[PDB]
Design a binder for this molecule. Structure first.
Ligand SMILES: O=C(Cc1cccs1)N[C@H](B(O)O)c1ccccc1
Length: 358
C-alpha cells in the first residue's frame, strides 16, 4: 500500500487494538477506488489462528445495509413499493394499529415504536405473527425513529415474499452472487468454518445465536475482501451491470427522514460531507443511536447524495464492525473486529483515517 495509507492505518489502529483489547481485526481502506488490506491478531485465540484476508467476521447490524439494498432491488424489480401497506404482504396482520404502517416505515424504524429486539420467546412463524399483532405502538407512524431489529427485520422478510424465495436465497441470488461476494454468508457452510473467527465477550469465545429475523437484521458474516467489494459497489453503483441491483443500491442511499444532522436510508445512514466528526463520533454511541427521536419526513426522498458520509455500525455479542464511505471522494473504510467495543472508538478511528486521506 502507498506509505501514506500504511502509516495512517497503522498509527490509528494499533493504539485502538491495544486500548480496546481487541483480539483480532481486519481493515480495508478503499482509496481512489482500490482496496488496501490490513490484519492484526487472532481469529481464534485458543487455536492460535491469525486473522487473514479470508477470515469471516459477524457483521452484526451492518447486515441491515444488505437487507436495505435487497429491498431496494425488489422495489426496482417492481415486486414491492415502499408506499405499500404492510398488510399487503402479510394479510394475517389484521390488528388495527397496522392500518397506515407502510414498508417504508418498517425499513426506516418509523412505524411507531417497534422494539429494538424480537423477543427470544418468538420462534415459530405464528409466534412472530402473534408478536406483531399484539404490539402496541407508542406513536403514530412516521413521527419518531426508534432503531429496531423488529422493524427492518420484518421489512426484509416481507420484501422477498413476492419473489417466492427464502430471504437467504434472495440475498445470495440477487445481491451476493451479482457482486461476486463469494465468501459472504447468512449461514456459514461447513467448508468455510476453518475461516470463521470466534467472537469474544468477557473473554469467552462466542458465535451469534439463532433468533427470529436474525438473517434480516444482523445475520451476515463476511471477509474483509468481500466487504471492501461491498463498499466499492455502494460507492459506484453505476458500474454494476445488473440494472435492478444498481437501482436498489441507489434507493438504499436515498434520504427518507432527518433527525438532527443524520438522514435515514434503507439500512445505510448518511450525513452531509464534510461532517462534523464529533457529530458522527458521539452520535454513534448506542444510547443516542438507539434513542427515540422525532423525525422530519423528506418529501420526496432525496436521491443518493454523492457528498455524504454514508455509514453503519454493527455488533453481535462477540463482534464489532463499522463501514463508512464518501461517494464524492471514492474513499471508504471497513473495520471488522472480534470484540464488540464502543461505537465512538470505531467512528473516531475511521474519521482519523479517512480525513487524513481525503
Ligand atoms: O442485535 C444485534 C445483534 C446481536 C447483539 C447481541 C446478540 S445478537 N445487533 C444490533 B445492531 O448491531 O445495531 C444491536 C441492537 C441493540 C443494541 C446493540 C446492537
Amino acid at each position: 500500500a502507498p506509505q501514506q495509507i500504511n502509516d495512517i492505518v497503522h498509527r490509528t489502529i494499533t493504539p485502538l487494538i491495544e486500548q480496546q483489547k481487541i483480539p483480532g481485526m481486519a481493515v480495508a481502506v478503499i482509496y481512489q477506488g482500490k482496496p488496501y488490506y490490513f490484519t492484526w491478531g487472532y481469529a481464534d485465540i485458543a487455536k492460535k489462528q491469525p486473522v487473514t484476508q479470508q477470515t469471516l467476521f459477524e457483521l452484526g447490524s451492518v447486515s441491515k445495509t444488505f437487507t436495505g439494498v435487497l429491498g431496494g432491488d425488489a422495489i426496482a424489480r417492481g415486486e414491492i413499493k415502499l408506499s405499500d401497506p404492510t398488510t399487503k404482504y402479510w394479510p394475517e396482520l389484521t390488528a388495527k394499529q397496522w392500518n397506515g404502517i407502510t414498508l417504508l416505515h418498517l425499513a426506516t424504524y418509523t412505524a411507531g415504536g417497534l422494539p429494538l429486539q424480537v423477543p427470544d420467546e418468538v420462534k415459530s412463524s405464528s409466534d412472530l405473527l402473534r408478536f406483531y399483532q399484539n404490539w402496541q405502538p407508542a406513536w403514530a407512524p412516521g413521527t419518531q425513529r426508534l432503531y429496531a431489529n423488529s422493524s427492518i427485520g420484518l421489512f426484509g422478510a416481507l420484501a422477498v415474499k413476492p419473489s417466492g424465495l427464502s430471504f437467504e436465497q434472495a440475498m445470495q441470488t440477487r445481491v451476493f452472487q451479482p457482486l461476486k461476494l463469494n465468501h459472504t454468508w447468512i449461514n456459514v457452510p461447513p467448508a468455510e468454518e476453518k475461516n470463521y473467527a470466534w467472537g469474544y465477550r468477557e473473554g469467552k469465545a462466542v458465535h451469534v445465536s439463532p433468533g427470529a429475523l436474525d438473517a434480516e437484521a444482523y445475520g451476515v458474516k463476511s471477509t474483509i475482501e468481500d466487504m471492501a467489494r461491498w463498499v466499492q459497489s455502494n460507492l459506484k453503483p453505476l458500474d454494476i451491470n445488473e440494472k435492478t441491483l444498481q437501482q436498489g443500491i441507489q434507493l438504499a442511499q436515498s434520504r427518507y427522514w432527518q433527525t438532527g444532522d443524520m438522514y435515514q436510508g434503507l439500512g445505510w445512514e448518511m450525513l452531509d460531507w464534510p461532517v462534523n466528526p464529533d457529530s458522527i463520533i458521539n452520535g454513534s454511541d448506542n444510547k443516542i443511536a438507539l434513542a427515540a427521536r422525532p423525525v422530519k419526513a423528506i418529501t420526496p426522498p432525496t436521491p443518493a447524495v454523492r457528498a455524504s458520509w454514508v455509514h453503519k455500525t454493527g455488533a453481535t455479542g462477540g463482534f464489532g464492525s463499522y463501514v463508512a464511505f464518501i461517494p464524492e471522494k471514492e474513499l471508504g473504510i471497513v473495520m471488522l473486529a472480534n470484540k464488540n467495543y464502543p461505537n465512538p472508538a470505531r467512528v473516531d478511528a475511521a474519521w482519523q483515517i479517512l480525513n487524513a486521506l481525503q
